[PDB]
């Protein structure tokens, strides 16, 4: 009559949020693991502001001609 | 920072193949950053004529053993 041990369905509940509370710490990690790693853009990554990378080099002796697509 | 500045001030001497590889890079991701290559080898060859020069060695052994 002193044994009052928690039922069997309240322990498999508890133990099963336990599990779910891993496996979804589980898949941040991997989602956080793919997330780095993946490629940024070149504002992110270097320039939020001047985005261009494309040179525009020295302005004292411009010759027509010089830019180039 | 200073890239692409000549000793007069004004674009160097092979800026244009430079520019057009970084306007490639701009339209590319790391995936299609291959498709750049045309684009680099010409930067790298107007910077060292690696190709003229082997060009002009083939010239000049035609003028050199085809007639001696």
Known sequence: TFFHPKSREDILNEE???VQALNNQRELT???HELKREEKD???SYSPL???PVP????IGKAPGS??? | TAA????TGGRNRCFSEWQSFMHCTAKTDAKSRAQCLPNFEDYMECLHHTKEKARLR???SVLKQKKE
């Open chain 1, 67 to 69: 830019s180039r697509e």
């Open chain 1, 56 to 59: 525009q080099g020295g302005s």
């Open chain 1, 42 to 44: 070149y504002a992110h």
């Open chain 1, 50 to 52: 001047f985005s261009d």
């Open chain 2, 4 to 7: 692409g500045i000549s000793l």
């Open chain 1, 30 to 32: 991997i989602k956080m």
């Open chain 1, 16 to 18: 099963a949020k336990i």
């Open chain 2, 58 to 60: 083939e010239i000049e």
